[PDB]
């Protein structure tokens, strides 16, 4: 995985915070998810900000208020700066030890998790992208208006990018919108069947399932169940889909056991019947579905039980999107963020190679 810093801009650091990046002129976070907040909390860092006062953390405004409701990571308050969403904004890093340099970052949408954002980097050694965890549909980056100099693309060096199913066998995943209206479909013909009817969604302890969790609720006309609520205080469009209250139809409530739970007829919040009456509950797990370059799309549903069921959805894009992104980027370089499961750096970089320049 990347360690935070490219070539081009070593001053600054994104997406991770421990070990070298210490002594970065500005730090930068792409989107709330564990594995991109490396150090960003540790006594180290801590130490190092109360001696050095003109580093700034760089984010989405998403971002900013989903890092801040952690208590954990509220010393950041006094030196977080929020970026709107492509609006190029002039950065100026200080060696604390006479150096000054200038740089220009564009945010770019993601479509990973709320917040998600591309860092286009602007300055002398060049530009670079820095996409974060990604998923765009073929076409979105062409839109993009700030990846653009006079009709092509910018003159892009490197492109520092999500990887997560950069293998041939990942070629194409279900869009957006294929993803939603199965689980929606799914669910709607199970939940108006009685009150009595409902549904766990079961999902990793982390942000990105919220524009499914709206829309069910947006479409349906019911909360949804989750174990905390808090961060979105601030966020109408997401908090007033979602409830504490365990007497919903929805439920996408979380606990180690759940899973045991779920196979003795009890949702993870312990909800096991209504008027005495058992509710009929079925299982749902959002799970990545793919199909290969010479095989056909199938139903973005798959039964796994009498009542339990596997549904698709990605936080990251094809192999497909992958490519097509990277053709239409054309960079002399591009570096894999993250190298697959069952795949090797060599593998992926010479995947890659062949949409770049050099
Ligand atoms: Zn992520
Ligand atoms: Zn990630
Ligand atoms: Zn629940």
């Given at each position: 995985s990347f360690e935070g810093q490219m070539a081009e801009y070593p001053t600054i650091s994104i997406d991770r915070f421990d070990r070298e990046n210490l002594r970065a002129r500005a730090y930068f976070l792409s989107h709330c998810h564990k594995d991109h907040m490396?150090?960003?909390?540790?006594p180290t860092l801590k130490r190092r900000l109360e001696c050095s006062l003109k580093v700034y953390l760089y984010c989405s405004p998403v971002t900013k208020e989903l890092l801040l409701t952690s208590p954990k990571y509220r010393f950041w308050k006094k030196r977080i700066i929020s970026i709107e969403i492509e609006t190029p904004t002039q950065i100026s890093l200080v060696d604390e030890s006479g150096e000054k340099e200038e740089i220009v970052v564009t945010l770019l949408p993601a479509?990973?998790?709320?917040?998600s954002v591309m860092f286009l980097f602007q300055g002398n050694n060049g530009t670079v992208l820095y996409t974060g965890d990604f998923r765009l549909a073929q076409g979105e980056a062409a839109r993009?208006?700030?990846?653009?100099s006079g009709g092509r693309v910018k003159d892009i060096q490197s492109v520092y990018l999500d990887?997560?199913?950069?293998?041939?066998?990942?070629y194409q995943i279900p869009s957006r919108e294929e993803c939603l209206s199965g689980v929606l479909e799914l669910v709607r013909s199970w939940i108006?069947?009685?009150?009595?009817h409902v549904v766990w969604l079961n999902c990793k302890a982390a942000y990105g399932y919220e524009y499914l969790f709206t829309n069910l609720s947006e479409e349906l006309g019911v909360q949804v169940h989750v174990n905390?609520?808090?961060?979105?205080?601030?966020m109408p469009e997401i908090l007033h889909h979602l409830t504490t209250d365990r007497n919903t139809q929805i439920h996408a409530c979380r606990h180690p056991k759940a899973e045991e739970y779920f196979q003795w007829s009890k949702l993870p919040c312990g909800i096991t019947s209504r008027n005495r009456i058992p509710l009929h509950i079925i299982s749902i797990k959002p799970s990545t579905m793919w199909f290969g370059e010479r095989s056909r799309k199938t139903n973005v549903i798959v039964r796994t039980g009498e009542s339990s069921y596997r549904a698709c959805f990605s936080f990251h894009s094809s192999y497909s999107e992958i490519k097509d992104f990277l053709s239409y980027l054309c960079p002399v370089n591009a570096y894999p963020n993250v190298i697959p499961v069952g795949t090797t750096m060599d593998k992926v970089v010479e995947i890659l190679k062949p949409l770049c320049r050099s």
């Open positions: 490396k150090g960003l909390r540790a479509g990973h998790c709320p917040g993009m208006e700030l990846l653009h990887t997560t199913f950069c293998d041939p066998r990942f108006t069947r009685s009150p009595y905390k609520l808090d961060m979105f205080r601030n």
